[PDB]
Amino acid sequence: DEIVISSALRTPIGAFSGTLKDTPAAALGAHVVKTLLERTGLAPERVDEVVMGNVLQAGNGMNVARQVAVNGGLPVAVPAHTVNRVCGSGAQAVVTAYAQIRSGLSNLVIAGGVENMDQAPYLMPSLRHGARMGHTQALDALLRDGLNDAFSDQHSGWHTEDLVAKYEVSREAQDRFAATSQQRFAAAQAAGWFEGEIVPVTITTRKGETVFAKDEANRPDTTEAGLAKLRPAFRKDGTITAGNAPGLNAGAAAMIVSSHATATELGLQPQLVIRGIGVAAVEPGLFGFGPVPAIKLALAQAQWQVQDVDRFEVNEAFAAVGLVVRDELGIAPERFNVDGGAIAHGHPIGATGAILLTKVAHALRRTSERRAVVSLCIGGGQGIALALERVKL
Amino acid sequence: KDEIVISSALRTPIGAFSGTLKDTPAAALGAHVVKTLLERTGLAPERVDEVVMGNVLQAGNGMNVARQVAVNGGLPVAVPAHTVNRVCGSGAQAVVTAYAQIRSGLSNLVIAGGVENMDQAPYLMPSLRHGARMGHTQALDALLRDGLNDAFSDQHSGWHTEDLVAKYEVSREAQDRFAATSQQRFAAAQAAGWFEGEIVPVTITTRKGETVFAKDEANRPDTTEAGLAKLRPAFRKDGTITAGNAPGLNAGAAAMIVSSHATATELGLQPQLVIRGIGVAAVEPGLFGFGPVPAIKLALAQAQWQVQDVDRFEVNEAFAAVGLVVRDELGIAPERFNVDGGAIAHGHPIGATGAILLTKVAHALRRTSERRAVVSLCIGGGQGIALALERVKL
Amino acid sequence: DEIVISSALRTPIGAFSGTLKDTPAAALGAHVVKTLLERTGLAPERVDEVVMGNVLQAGNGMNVARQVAVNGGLPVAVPAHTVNRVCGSGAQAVVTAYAQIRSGLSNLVIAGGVENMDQAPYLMPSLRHGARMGHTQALDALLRDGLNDAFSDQHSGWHTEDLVAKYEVSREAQDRFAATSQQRFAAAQAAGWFEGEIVPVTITTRKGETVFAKDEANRPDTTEAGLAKLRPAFRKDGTITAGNAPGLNAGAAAMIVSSHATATELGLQPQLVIRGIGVAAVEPGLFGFGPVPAIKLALAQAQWQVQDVDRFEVNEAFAAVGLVVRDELGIAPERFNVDGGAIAHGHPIGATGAILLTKVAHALRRTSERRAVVSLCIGGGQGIALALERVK
Amino acid sequence: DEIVISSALRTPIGAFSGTLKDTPAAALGAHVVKTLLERTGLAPERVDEVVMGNVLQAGNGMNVARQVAVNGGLPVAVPAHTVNRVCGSGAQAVVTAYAQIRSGLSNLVIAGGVENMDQAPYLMPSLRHGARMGHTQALDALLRDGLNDAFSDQHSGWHTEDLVAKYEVSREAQDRFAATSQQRFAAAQAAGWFEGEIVPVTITTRKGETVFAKDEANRPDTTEAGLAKLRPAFRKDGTITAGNAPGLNAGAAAMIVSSHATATELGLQPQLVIRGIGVAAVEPGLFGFGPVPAIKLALAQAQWQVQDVDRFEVNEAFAAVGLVVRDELGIAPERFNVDGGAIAHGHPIGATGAILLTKVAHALRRTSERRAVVSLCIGGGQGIALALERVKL
């Protein structure tokens, strides 16, 4: 009856123009899936479906999920499809898996997400049928398909300044939150707390192989004083900066989704039980609020109250989004993004939801905490949340 | 289990390559169908729990096509939406996704469909972000890179389908006979008014005014076996597949309501089909045209139907060769296979086609009083999707 | 030691997106040169140099003039170079030829110009080293390298509205001049007056040929009433429209330049003597005035005055430029662009100067007029003029 | 009347992706012209014309020569035009000037050339009227308009392998020539022999200012042993490498051309008399041979024999071209590219001819040598040569 997550694994997260800049999103997912199969010893024929989140599908080739599955070493008989709920896509893949299992379409699904923002191409809308006369634009696909609202064409960061204004989120509070994310992430990383969830990727370049084993996007030297000096990135009188938002990152995460009975039968070690799912939508312009209704839905399904939850893992799309969700729900600061968030480690859009589920799977194992919520705000005005309970042993 | 049903299946007419819809984004086509569906049904917009849309060529369509379809279709901003991609099967996948959400208790009512506009697919410049440095560089047609070329070989779907032709010994003449028959069946059904009920007109604004696009335009009623025999192979020098025994590069949208039978009745909807069986299968990428065979067998097994129980099979004409291989492998009577013609005539707007075929069957069973149908599509990359569908008695 | 023009020939002029849209400028020039050699029977080894004007060189390949020469059938031993004085380039090629002959560097030069504005590519300045993040521009080379001023980045038509304001050139006068250009051109064309100067080009398509034999860009049905309805193209409350300016055209012209003695020695039939050359420069913003100082310089060299000249052939860059030059010099309206101009036939930038020299060579032969001036205004603020006399 | 060159000056030559990568060719020419006017005190009204060579005109804006003239500070009443005889363009500008003066069209011309190969754009031939369906090419303009033959579409370096084969030019001879070019250039540079001809350019960058005062493309540490290790650049079994050919360089040069009488009247100090001009053409495929007929034409006009010439300055388009021209004409190695050539300093195509005239003007002043020949081979199968005599005082 219970649907469980087993063997959650992720790549380290690459910086913009960083170690993963030449490695397609689909190749990162294939690497995690191959490693997952090697470590679990799961019979590849027991995989009924591969579901992968991917937002910037432009130029990635036919059906990213099918490339992840086949290049990950699964038999050609394993079906696969790609899901896009923007920032929530990596968590959506796990919700899709849950729905397939609960509806009887699948017994075991490999679910996750992939993204590489460097690898997003430029688009030429006028090249097919011609520009005819006069200058024409080449669009950055990461803005057109990933970060700009589809209704306004304004950046997500520009819209988030209206969330800042509505909830009176001070520059000082955003920079305090951002510095704390960096400090928490650096301490956890140094303590080895992310080694269990990370699978190394070997990158071959010119006359070199480089073993990419550790998240590279974080800035342990970040201070409130340093952050206060940065210029607003999206509006002249704004509060959001390069320092209180994540970068343009690359990575992949994947996990096994099955009934508890299926996991036990196949000698898997379940990490989390899915106790509740929430998917909600709000005004595109206030998309940072999306986690609030989504979390309420997930908690209602789990029959939990906010104060019953050991940790909330809410995507740091902006420091401002973290603060609005934490403060609106009255979550204790010590229980909110406990080991740091995307401001430190990065936001590889379509993978981030799978990365946060992976983080919580390993954090509950280490701490013996019982109850967690993963939630992400979603460009276009949506929210996704999963209520998750540790499985013992 | 309560029965999961399809209600109010509707589609745009299908545009030709460089045709009437060439300047109308896929998301705008879906928005138009959703708006019309809400207007005609009077469905309370707050009772829509999710919009799921198939779309294969997402490049340049903007953030989350399904959310654009939902919001521009007039649904409240409180309705969530996501986009699915199982290539050619995406429009049928959206309905399977809806089924799974309802059966799992995540949703009570979903608007599901698909959208595609192949003219609107942009060119891609992989080297523009970090530079070409020195030497010529390529601009990729996204239609090929993300839609029609296999991701493993980079060869066209049509090139791979010549290996299906060789394996099953499908003659050029058999493919051209099938293609001519698809055009003749489609033209006769169209002229008889059999597609009027499923089609919603789209008003297109241009420099020189408005065009009311009300009728499929990609079909060639004058097609003959003799005319098709004149054409050159499109994909291999010694090949059999031509521009005439394959569909075009088309544009369109289709959408429908998916819910329990009880939910449909409660909200004053008129269910058209019950989903009796779902099959999703995968095969060698190189032999993807065979995908419907295992998918149909899975869907029939779930419905507890045999091939001979099915009044009509609606199998996507990705190529005439795929239609022939699937029909003959399953032993389906030619008179019961793509009865009113298929994609060779009306077109293959990739991510919408699965939703278009479900829509076609919903209206055809209502007209004929046929009881049982199977919709199936082969899928680039080596997959197959099938739904076993039963008419609801109204 | 008179320098003469012989065997001036041109292609018909193609419309924007018209019959020549798939035929490179260099191929148009090659075709004229091949035809010129076939008709004259000139020994190819007697050609010392090929000089070709071409403004939009982007994407045309290494040295357009050398492609015209070699693809035109001349021996590989014939040197060639490409000149760019924007709108004046096709006339500049003939001035370059004159200078080479008078200085003893050459005895016989094939000089002309080529342009195909459809064939001008788009430019991607950010593709070499990357756009990194954010949308980036692809430039239309015909604007960047051909029609926009290099200092202001404003269109030539936008700058010409300041010439209109300075000289108080009414919209009605511009439209009357434009209608008259169309009417004069259509009547002359119908009378066969352009047959002698035009060489047909065969264009190969699908499984088909098109023989392109006649200018296609003109609008014989043009009226003042029709032109009055058009919207300003360059400024909101402007006077310049699509109807009182030329299009974005394609074509080529070429001719033999030599001493009179060399022409006679080689059995050529000289058409014109170059009696005077003027090259002048003005404010980029008032480039339409450029022909005035250039014409005065050319007339001074020829020891002619305006009233001595049977016809002026001044490029119709805009109707406004034609009117300003005509009225500043006091030229009789019936002696100014007598058989119509670029508003009707088109302005294939780098070829136009060679096309106007070609037109005048054939018009003086037909009319027995003695004296002509060819002049063009030049984007960036220049003018070129040649004073020309009919050879018997 | 003698036609003379006065006040020949050049920028230092930039490396590919080097100091001048963001400075348009037209701006480099403007800087030389402005400096030339400032130093000579020449009355700007006495300039009858500016003629500039430029090969890669794509994207440089309307009429590069007019931009050089106007941005160089000359009155708008000075006419200007741009010439293109590919690699010979910078020398062609001086021949054009000579012809204008001798024919009476001009009394005084500022002639030179400009090029910036980094600044050459990519071209999209199919963007105006559309690619319709299928992949399409974006062309590197430096290949399409500058370095690939217009008839074969093969690189100039690929064609030069046929010159190598015809004249049996060994790899070892090419590498010896290239090493010697580097050694000669480095010694001459260190001796201060290029200070007189070079005008510094101040480059304003994001982070501040660079005073670019010295040629940067040369490799003084070059050895025959090092060059022997390099892979062929153009054919698998080839001899031409990155080390025995010049780079993709940027720079400008300009000079005053006038009668001797005009120069003296205006207080200029003539450096060279033009005693002979040769322009020749050959098979496009053997364009490296072009200097041979061109030099014979220039020497015939000057009534000189090869052995009467104190130094030959023949553009090092490839080491192979230098060797073929030197050995075909029987020129003493000690009198051929005496202070090094383009393999060391670079080949900024449309400027190189003006750079070589400038180099010879200053070298004859220093050495009191009487007679020089400047010659360049030209893509498409041409050659240009000038026979030049030192003017005293």
Q: What is the DSSP string of C129-143?
A: T---SS-EEEEEHII
Tokens linked to D392: 């005293």
Would you state the structure tokens that stand for residue B94, as one six-digit string?
């959206």
Tokens standing for residue D238:
């080839």
- Return the residue matching tokens 């009924």: A48
Q: Report the C-alpha dihedral over residues D324, D328, D333, D339, rounded to 10 degrees.
A: -60
Rounded CA-CA distance D75/D45 in Å is 7
Sorted by sequence, the CB contacts under 8 Å of residue C209 that are 6+ apart come out as C202, C203
Strands (E), C92-134: 108-116, 122-124
CA gap A253, A106 in Å, rounded: 20
| CB atoms closer than 10 angstroms to residue C44 | 15
Residue that the structure tokens 């204790």 belong to: A332
Nearest-angstrom CA–CA distance, B176 and B231: 10
DSSP D83: E
Task: Tell me how far the alpha carbon of residue B162 is from its chain's centroid.
Answer: 22
Q: How many Cα neighbours within 13 Å face the side chain of A344? A: 25
Which H or E run contains B125? strand B123-125
Residue among C122, C123, C126, C127 with most chain B CBs within 10 A, to mutate: C127
Residue D135 at interface with chain A, using a CB cutoff of 8 Å: no
Question: Do A8 and A82 contact (CB within 8 A), yes or no?
Answer: no
Q: Which of B85, B69, B81 is nearest to B146 (CA)?
A: B85
Question: Do the beta carbons of residue A383 and residue A346 sit within 8 Å?
Answer: no
Question: CA distances (Å), D151 to each of B210, D280, D376, in order?
Answer: 49, 18, 20
Radius of gyration of chain A (CA): 20
Beta-bridged to residue A251, according to DSSP, are A115
Residue C105 Cα distances to A194, B361, D89, D298, D301, angstroms? 79, 83, 17, 11, 10
Q: Nearest CB to B104: which of A26, A99, A380?
A: A99
Among residues D53, D334, D288, the alpha carbon closest in space to that of D149 is found at D288
Among residues B371, B43, B98, the alpha carbon closest in space to that of B259 is found at B98
Contact of A57 with A123, CB cutoff 8 Å = no
The one-letter code for the residue type at D19 is T
Q: How was this structure determined?
A: X-ray
The full length of chain D comes to: 393
Residue D87 is among the residues annotated as catalytic for this protein: yes
- The amino acid present at C174, given as its one-letter code, is Q
- Using CA atoms, how far apart are residues B154 and B152, in angstroms rounded to an integer? 6
Give the C-alpha separation, B324 to B332, whole Å. Answer: 10
CB D65 within 8 A of CB D151: no
Q: Encoding tokens for residue B68?
A: 């654009």
Asked whether the CA dihedral A338, A344, A345, A350 is positive or negative, the reply is positive
Q: Which residues contact D281 (CB under 8 A, 6 or more apart)?
A: C76, C77, C78, C79, C80, D290, D381, D382, D383
* Calpha distance C240→C158 (Å, rounded): 8
CB D14 within 8 A of CB D105: no
Q: Where on the phi/psi map is residue C71: left (φ > 0), alpha (ψ -120 to 50), or beta?
A: alpha
Q: Does B152 touch chain A (CB under 8 A)?
A: yes
Q: Report yes or no: D129 at the A interface, CB cutoff 8 Å.
A: yes
Contacts for D202-211: CB closer than 8 Å, 24+ residues apart: D203/D19, D203/D20, D203/D22, D203/D23, D205/D22, D210/D19
Q: Write out the DSSP string of C194-231.
A: TTTTB--EEEEETTEEEEE-S--S--TT--HHHHHTSP
Closest CA relative to residue B342, chosen from B195, B139, B164, B147 = B195
Q: How far is CA A104 from the centre of its chain?
A: 27
Single-letter residue type at A267:
G
Counted residue by residue, chain C has a size of: 392
Residue D49 CA from chain centroid, whole number: 20
Question: Quick check: A134 and C143 CB within 8 A?
Answer: yes
Count Cβ atoms within 10 A of the Cβ of residue B368 and give its class: 0-12 exposed, 13-18 middle, 19 or more buried. Answer: middle
Q: Transcribe C151-167 into DSSP letters.
A: TT--BHHHHHHHHHHHH
Q: What single-letter DSSP state applies at residue A45?
A: G
How many other C-beta atoms lie within 10 A of the C-beta of residue C206? Answer: 5
State the Cα–Cα distance between residues D39 and D48, nearest whole angstrom: 19
Closest CA to B381 of A49, A82, A66, A81: A66
Q: Which of A314, A199, A178 is nearest to A251 (CA)?
A: A199
DSSP at A220: T
**Of all helices (H) and strands (E), which one includes residue C352?**
helix C349-367
d(CA A13, CA A354): 12
Angle, alpha carbons A353-A358-A360 (nearest 5°): 100
CB D169 within 8 A of CB D320: yes
Residue type, C220: P
Whether residue A260 lies in the annotated active site? no
The rounded distance, in Å, linking the Cα atoms of D85 and D99 is: 16
Beta pairing class for D371-378 and D311-314: parallel
What's the maximum distance between 2 C-alpha atoms anywhere in chain A?
Answer: 68
Spatial distance between the Cα atoms of D168 and D190, rounded to a whole number of angstroms: 35
Return the amino acid letter for B75.
L
- Smallest CA-to-CA distance from A300 within A282, A271, A316, A278 is with A278
Cα(B240)–Cα(B225) distance, integer angstroms? 14
| Continuous H helices in C231-348 | 260-265, 291-302, 319-329, 342-345
Cβ neighbours of residue B196 under 8 Å, at least 6 residues apart?
none
Q: Measuring CA to CA, which residue among C22, C52, C56 is closest to residue C348? A: C56
Half-sphere exposure at residue C215, Cβ-oriented, CA atoms within 13 angstroms: 34
Q: How far is CA C253 from CA B261, C11, C153, D63, in A?
A: 78, 6, 29, 21
Q: Indicate which residue of A31, A159, A347, A362 is catalytic.
A: A347
Give me D41's structure tokens.
Answer: 């005190």
Name the one residue in this structure whose structure tokens are 């309501």.
B257
Burial class (CB in 10 A: 0-12, 13-18, 19+), D368: exposed
- CA A156: distance to chain centroid? 16
Type of residue at D288: G
In the DSSP assignment, the letter for residue D155 is B
- Name residue A344's amino acid: A
C268's tokens: 């050529």
The verdict on B139 touching C (C-beta cutoff 8 Å) is: no
Residues B75/B51, Cβ–Cβ less than 8 Å: yes
Q: Rounded to a whole number, what is the distance in angstroms from the first to the last CA of chain D?
A: 19
Beta bridge partners of C205: C208
Query: Is C136–A138 a contact, with Cβ atoms under 8 angstroms apart?
Result: yes
Q: Tell me if A201 sits within 8 A of A11, measured CB to CB.
A: yes
Please give the C-alpha separations between residue B369 and each of B192, B272, B312, B390, C336, in angstroms, as whole numbers: 17, 11, 12, 10, 81
Contact assessment for residue A82 and residue A376, using Cβ atoms and an 8 Å cutoff: no
Task: Specify whether the CB–CB gap between D132 and A128 falls below 8 A.
Answer: yes
List the beta strands (DSSP E) in chain D.
3-10, 49-53, 80-84, 108-116, 122-124, 136-140, 201-205, 208-212, 250-259, 270-281, 311-314, 371-378, 382-390
Dihedrals phi, psi of A154, to nearest 5 degrees: -90, 150
Cα-Cα end-to-end distance for chain C: 17
* Beta-bridge partner residues of A122: A140, B125
User: Between C66, C282, C380, which is nearest D380 by CB?
Assistant: C66
- Which H helix or E strand runs over B224? none
E strand or H helix at B328: helix B320-330
Phi, psi for residue A321 in degrees, rounded to 5 = -65, -45
Report the distance separating Cα B310 and Cα B312, nearest Å.
6
Q: What is the DSSP secondary structure assignment for residue D289, as one 8-state letter?
A: G
Q: What angle do CA D179, D182, D186 make, to 5 degrees?
A: 140
**CB nearest A143 (choices: C124, C135, C140):** C135
CB A146 within 8 A of CB A131: no
**What span, in angstroms and rounded, lies between the C-alpha atoms of C333 and C321?**
14
Q: Is A136 on the interface with D (CB under 8 A)?
A: yes
B306 token code pair = 């045999």
C174 in Cβ contact with C318 (< 8 Å): yes
List the structure tokens of B66: 């399904």
Catalytic residue among C31, C155, C159, C377: C377
**Which residue is associated with the tokens 């967690």?**
A372
Cβ atoms D169, D163 nearer than 8 A = yes
Partner residues linked to B375 by β-bridges: B314, B387
Collapsing DSSP to helix, strand or coil, C255 comes out as strand
Name every chain C residue with its beta carbon within 8 A of the beta carbon of A131.
122, 138, 140
What resolution (Å)? 1.8
* DSSP-based three-state secondary structure for B146: helix
Q: What is the DSSP letter of A365?
A: H
Known active-site residue A345:
no
Rounded to a whole number of angstroms, the distance from the CA of A142 to the nearest CA of chain D is: 21
User: What residues form DSSP beta bridges with D312?
Assistant: D336, D373
Are A63 and B151 in contact (CB < 8 Å)?
Answer: yes
Q: Which residues does residue A211 pair with via DSSP β-bridges, in sequence order?
A: A202
**CATH for A86:** 3.40.47.10
Distance CA A112, CA C293 (A): 75
A137 touching chain D per CB within 8 A = no
Give the torsion through C-alpha atoms of B226, B229, B230, B235, to 10 deg.
150
* Residue D330 burial (10 A CB sphere; 0-12, 13-18, 19+): exposed
CB contact under 8 A, D140 and C128: yes
Q: How many CB pairs under 8 A join B and C?
A: 24
Residue type at A43? A
Half-sphere exposure of D178 (CA within 13 A, CB side): 33
Residues 6+ apart with CB under 8 A from C176: C224
Q: Please say whether the beta carbons of B244 and B207 come within 8 A.
A: no
Nearest Cα residue in chain D from B22:
D132
Q: Which two tokens stand for residue D289?
A: 């041979």
Cβ(D329)–Cβ(D300) below 8 Å: no
Cβ contact A301:A98 at 8 Å = no
Answer positive or negative: Cα dihedral of A226, A229, A233, A234: positive
D131–A contact, CB cutoff 8 A: yes
Query: Can you spell out the DSSP letters for B5-48?
Result: EEEEEEEPPPBPTTSTTTTS-HHHHHHHHHHHHHHHH---GGG-
Please state, in angstroms and rounded to a whole number, the distance separating the CA atoms of residues C303 and C308. Answer: 10
E-strand stretches of B287-371: 312-315
Instruction: Quote the DSSP letter at residue D143.
Output: I
Tokens of C330: 């006091």
Distance separating alpha carbons of residues B225 and A118, to the nearest angstrom: 50
Q: Which residues contact C148 (CB under 8 A, 6 or more apart)?
A: C154, C155, C156, D61, D62
A130–chain D nearest CA distance, Å:
4
The answer to whether C273 faces chain A, any CB pair under 8 Å, is: no
CA atoms of D152 and D137, how far apart (whole Å): 18
How many Cβ pairs closer than 8 A exist between chain A and B? 227
DSSP-based three-state secondary structure for C111: strand
CA B324 remoteness from chain centre: 18
**Under a CB-based contact definition with an 8 Å cutoff, are residues A136 and C138 in contact?**
yes
Enclosing domain of residue A51: 3-121+248-270
Distance CA D93, CA D112 (A): 6
Distance between CA atoms of residues D8 and C380, nearest Å: 26
A384 φ, ψ (degrees, to nearest 5) = -130, 140
Q: Find out whether C27 and C71 touch, Cβ atoms under 8 Å.
A: yes
Token readout for B350 is 């990739």
Q: Which residues contact D15 (CB under 8 A, 6 or more apart)?
A: D216, D217, D247, D249, D346
Side-chain-facing half-sphere of C349: CA atoms under 13 Å: 26
Q: How far is CA C276 from CA C51, C272, C307, C329, in A?
A: 20, 12, 16, 17
Q: Which residue in A155, A159, A362, A377 is the catalytic one?
A: A377
Look up residue B291 and give its DSSP letter: T
Helix or strand or coil: residue C275?
Answer: strand
Strand partners, D234: none
Which residue, among C17, C7, C27, has the nearest Cα to C251 in the 3D structure?
C27
Contact A57 B59 (CB under 8 A): yes
CB atoms within 10 A of CB D296: 15
